[PDB]
């Protein structure tokens, strides 16, 4: 019953440990026991206990004082404030013992904590003058003892204890508030997660009560700039983020303070608010946008900030928003649009990354507008940007189109990617074109796929591509083929004995290859290094020899690039990998072609795949044949296998004309060694070729004849068995049955000129000319129309046309005019044109048939003109009459005739005098005709310039390509035009002018290398010559000289660089002008 300094230390403790129990068990109700123990309660607070050096005593006394507050509440016994302060500070010092969870006394310290927490004893200190020091020291203690050794009951009691002080207190000083917020600072949060969790629990529990002091904290430092208020002033933004996640209400009055800070003129401060709000808005569970719309709208406005880092931050933020907040995606579309056009490359680039990143997670997170933005960026001016957009669309295709990762309806949303990506191959940029190739190899038709799967993929892809897409893909095949050949040529040059000559040849080849590589400024120098390595390392040569061989499988190729890359193991090694991936076969080899033809075979008989693969079995078959036809030109050797030829044989006996027509064309292009390596195929093929060659159809008969010529060494005797029977069947009584025989004979006459020289010569002279072209057994119906579909043409006309094409092939076979046989045919074709198509002039022939005969004769001369030996024979008068076909009364005639000129000129096989004909298209009423004529001129003038740019010129071969040399021909052609009758007439000379201006406007558009000076020097020279078609004819030379002055008037009035010196003295055509004053214009011009 007594505890004092008199008793032994042992007995005192013994008494205390009993006094703890009675105080613990006592009740607030027991007035009796309270009045009794009241004096002991007052005594236990004595300074003898509060400062007792024994740890166990202070603990026991602390527990007592706690219950003593519990029992006597709400009216404690200790009244002295100075004494009441000593107690609660003493208790706080004891709470330090909570830290050692392994001590045997811990549970007593826990009882102390549990008691003051339940009783809210510390609330007594609200009235004490030093309340803030007490509460601050309490908070620091609790946050410094909490560790991973404490269960949730400890955490809970500490929150209860600290919550009361805030909720039921008069105020919260900044100092006291800081003891809580400091635990949230990132540096502290990192080293002490326990104190951090405790602070969160506290702030959450007391959110309503503490909001004003938090609001006051931020308002002082953000708005009023007072940093001295707290040592946590630097961490405000870190704290606002932490606080928002604990409870939104904590920032009730802080969000308006952020909205104000967005309007700040301080770029760095404005940036930080945006960085912050990005995390707040962007977070997955966040709902700040719905809860505070004005802040959301005020935030989105920063997408248009002048400061680049703020824009960049908003753009990076968009990715997270798109992924985490689909419903907010619509508020971003307009801002992502304008930023895709940003002046800063970094912003344009990151708009793509954000849209793609969202798309790759789920395509439904991005709409059509956002993908269209990525599309628009493939045409960006910066390579790094369009590189990002193309790769983006590739990765999207591979997921949501190839693999259908989001269903079938989603794959139709992006059906445009495959086409658009391949259209990029038409770009001038070498970097772009080579990237399309990498994309095609990785993302569209993955190379790592097994052969059969890889061609199944390609087959259905090729069947669903745009028209320009498949064209791009064909051009890609062709370019690699050309490059592989250039490399094999280089290797062969290196293998030669090294002379000064081969050294130069090697440099030329190197220079050509580098034009097909990125960064030609470094490629030229890297290929110098490359040739050096090849001359030395024989083992690297071998590996490249294998990689470039036409029988290189895709497997071997992967091995070859491996070995070469190894033995060169830095920007140099990067360059060669570009070269190696271009030439290395990835898709097409011998086994692939076999798999692909088998895939088309399947499609023809059942297959069941076409329907579920999303393509009509019809167009899939047609595409597969076109694909094989294309690959037969680019990869012919790859068709050389037993499996492929066996598959092609079955295709050749299908009864489907389009399938058989394709198989024949493929055999023609790849069957060069069938007879040697596959004799059973050869013998199986013979009977079919003879059948098709005899019974048609025409198209297949043609291909059959060329197949025999290509494959069989015995082709001579083969042709005999075919020709002689077909030679007999030629009877004018049968018209319908003469089509196929005439076709077959024509191609035989082309491929076997000497073997059948005499029968053909007689055949043409008697049957074609006299018996067939001179009669009209079946007069076509009389009509007003000038043209009819192929169906409605009289079968006799169709035979005449085919008989004309036969004569041309008969001449192209001979390639000589020795026996004056070419003159005869050219004389005949001319009379057909001069008689408007009615060779007999009896009027029994139909008008549409006459049109098709004019077109046939006009087309014939143009084809013969492409053969040098017959070009010599074509007289000016014949050529001039042929030229007038470009202005035929019939639209179809002039259209197709023009198409034939374009084709002859595009292949650089038709002389420029035939390009001058296009000048007469200025007389064409039809807009479409004038457009095509100009199109023809532009394309033909350019390719002739680009060709001369690369290739070294030669005396006679240079005049043939220089576009400027069209002007003399154009001047001559117009001077002889039928409409130009009266020499000095105005309206006729207005016509001559617009014709000249039709070609000159295009020819002069470049204006480089003294083009204009060169032209005027030609025109000057013409005035010093004679018409050559009639040198003595004065009136004819007057007409020549005046057309020159009209031409001269155009040049003078449309340029300023004409008066310069000509680079070279122009040589006029000898057969248009003889070897070399005033103006011949009427003054009204």
């Amino acid at each position: 019953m007594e505890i004092s300094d008199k008793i032994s230390k042992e007995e005192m403790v013994r008494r205390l440990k009993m006094v703890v129990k009675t105080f613990m068990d006592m009740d607030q109700d027991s007035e009796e026991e309270k009045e009794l123990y009241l004096n002991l309660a007052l005594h236990l607070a004595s300074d003898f206990f509060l400062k007792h050096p024994d740890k166990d005593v202070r603990l026991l006394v602390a527990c007592c004082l706690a219950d003593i507050f519990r029992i006597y509440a709400p009216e404690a016994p200790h009244t002295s404030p100075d004494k009441l302060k000593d107690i609660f500070m003493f208790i706080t010092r004891q709470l330090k013992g909570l830290e050692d969870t392994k001590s045997p006394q811990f549970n007593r310290y826990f009882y102390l904590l549990e008691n003051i927490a339940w009783v809210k004893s510390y609330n007594i200190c609200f009235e004490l003058e030093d309340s803030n020091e007490i509460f601050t020291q309490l908070y620091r203690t609790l946050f410094s003892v909490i560790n991973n050794g404490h269960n949730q009951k400890v955490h809970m009691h500490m929150v209860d204890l600290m919550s009361s002080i805030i909720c039921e207190g008069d105020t919260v000083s900044q100092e006291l508030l800081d003891t809580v917020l400091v635990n949230l600072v990132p540096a502290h949060k990192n080293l002490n997660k326990q104190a951090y969790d405790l602070a969160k629990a506290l702030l959450k529990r007391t959110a309503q009560a503490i909001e004003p002091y938090i609001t006051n904290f931020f308002n002082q430092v953000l708005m009023l700039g007072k940093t001295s208020i707290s040592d946590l002033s630097e961490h405000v933004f870190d704290l606002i983020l932490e606080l928002y996640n604990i409870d939104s209400h904590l920032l009730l009055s802080v969000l308006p303070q952020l909205e104000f800070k967005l309007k700040s003129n301080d770029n760095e401060e404005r940036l930080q608010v945006v960085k912050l709000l990005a995390k707040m808005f962007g977070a997955k569970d966040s709902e700040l946008a719905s809860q505070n719309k004005p802040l959301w709208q005020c935030y989105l406005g920063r997408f248009n900030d002048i400061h680049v880092p703020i824009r960049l931050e908003c753009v990076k933020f968009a990715s997270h928003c798109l992924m985490n907040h689909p419903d907010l995606a619509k508020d971003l579309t307009e801002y992502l649009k304008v930023r895709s056009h940003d002046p800063e490359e970094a912003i344009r680039h990151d708009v793509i990354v954000s849209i793609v990143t969202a798309a790759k997670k789920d395509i439904l997170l991005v709409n059509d507008h956002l993908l269209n933005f990525v599309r628009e960026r493939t045409l960006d001016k910066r390579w790094r940007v369009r590189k990002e957009a193309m790769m983006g669309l590739a990765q999207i295709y591979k997921k949501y189109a190839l693999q259908s990762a989001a269903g079938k309806d989603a794959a139709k949303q992006i059906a445009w990617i495959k086409d658009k990506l391949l259209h990029i191959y038409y770009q001038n940029s070498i970097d772009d074109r080579l990237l399309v190739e990498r994309i095609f190899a990785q993302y569209m038709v993955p190379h790592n796929l097994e052969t059969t799967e890889r061609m199944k993929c390609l087959y259905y892809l090729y069947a669903t591509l745009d028209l320009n897409a498949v064209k791009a893909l064909n051009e890609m095949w062709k370019c690699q083929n050309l490059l592989r050949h250039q490399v094999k040529d280089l290797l062969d040059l290196i293998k030669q004995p090294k002379t000064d000559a081969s050294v130069k040849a090697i440099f030329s080849k190197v220079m050509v290859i580098t034009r097909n590589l990125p960064d030609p400024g470094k490629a030229q120098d890297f290929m110098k290094k490359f040739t050096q390595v090849l001359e030395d390392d024989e083992k690297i040569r071998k590996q490249l020899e294998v990689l470039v061989s036409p029988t290189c499988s895709c497997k071997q190729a992967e091995g070859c690039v491996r070995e070469i890359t190894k033995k060169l193991g830095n920007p140099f090694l990067e360059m060669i990998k570009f070269l190696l991936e271009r030439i290395a076969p990835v898709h097409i080899d011998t086994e692939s072609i076999s798999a692909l033809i088998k895939q088309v075979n399947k499609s023809i008989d059942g297959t069941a795949d076409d329907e579920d693969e999303g393509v009509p079995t019809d167009q899939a078959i047609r595409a597969g044949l076109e694909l094989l036809k294309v690959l037969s030109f680019t990869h012919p050797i790859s068709f050389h296998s037993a499996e492929t030829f066996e598959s092609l044989l079955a295709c050749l006996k299908m009864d489907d004309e389009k399938v058989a027509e394709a198989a024949l064309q493929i055999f023609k292009n790849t069957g060069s060694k069938i007879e040697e390596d596959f004799p059973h195929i050869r013998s199986a093929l013979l009977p079919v070729l003879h059948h098709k060659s005899k019974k048609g159809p025409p198209r297949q008969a043609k291909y059959a004849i060329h197949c025999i010529h290509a494959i069989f060494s015995s082709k001579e005797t083969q042709f005999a068995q075919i020709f002689e029977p077909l030679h007999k069947s030629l009877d004018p009584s049968n018209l319908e049955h003469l089509i196929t025989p005439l076709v077959t004979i024509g191609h035989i006459a082309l491929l076997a000129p000497d073997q059948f020289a005499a029968p053909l010569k007689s055949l043409v002279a008697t049957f074609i000319v006299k018996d067939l072209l001179m009669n009209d057994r079946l007069p076509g119906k009389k009509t007003t129309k000038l043209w009819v579909p192929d169906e409605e043409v009289s079968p006799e006309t169709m035979v005449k046309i085919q008989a004309i094409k036969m004569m041309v092939r008969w001449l192209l076979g001979m390639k000589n005019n020795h026996s004056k046989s070419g003159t005869s045919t050219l004389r005949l074709l001319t009379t057909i044109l001069h008689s408007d198509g009615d060779l007999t002039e009896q009027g029994k022939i139909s008008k549409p048939d006459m049109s098709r005969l004019r077109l046939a004769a006009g087309s014939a001369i143009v084809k013969l003109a492409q053969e040098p030996c017959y070009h010599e024979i074509i007289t000016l008068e014949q050529y001039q009459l042929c030229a007038l076909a470009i202005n035929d009364e019939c639209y179809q005639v002039r259209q197709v005739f023009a198409q034939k000129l374009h084709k002859g000129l595009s292949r650089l096989r038709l002389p420029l005098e035939y390009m001058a004909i296009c000048a007469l298209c200025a007389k064409d009423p039809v807009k479409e005709r004038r457009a095509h004529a100009r199109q023809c001129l532009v394309k033909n003038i350019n390719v002739r310039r680009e060709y001369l740019k690369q290739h070294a010129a030669v005396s006679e071969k240079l005049l043939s390509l220089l576009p400027e040399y069209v002007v003399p021909y154009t001047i001559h052609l117009l001077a002889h035009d039928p409409d130009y009758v009266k020499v000095q007439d105005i309206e006729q000379l207005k016509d001559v002018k617009e014709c000249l201006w039709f070609v000159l406007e295009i020819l002069m558009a470049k204006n480089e290398n003294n083009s204009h000076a060169f032209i005027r020097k030609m025109v000057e020279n013409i005035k010093q010559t004679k018409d050559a078609q009639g040198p003595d004819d004065a009136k004819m030379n007057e007409k020549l000289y005046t057309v020159c002055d009209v031409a001269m008037n155009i040049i003078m009035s449309k340029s300023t660089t004409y008066s310069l010196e000509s680079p070279k003295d122009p040589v006029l055509p000898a057969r248009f002008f003889t070897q070399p004053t005033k103006n011949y214009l009427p003054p009204e011009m």
């Binding site: 607030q28 509440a73 709400p74 339940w118 009783v119 809210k120 609330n123 007594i124 039921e168 207190g169």
Partner: peptide, 5 residues
């Protein structure tokens, strides 16, 4: 019974 305000 406890201390509250």
């Amino acid at each position: 019974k406890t201390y509250s305000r």
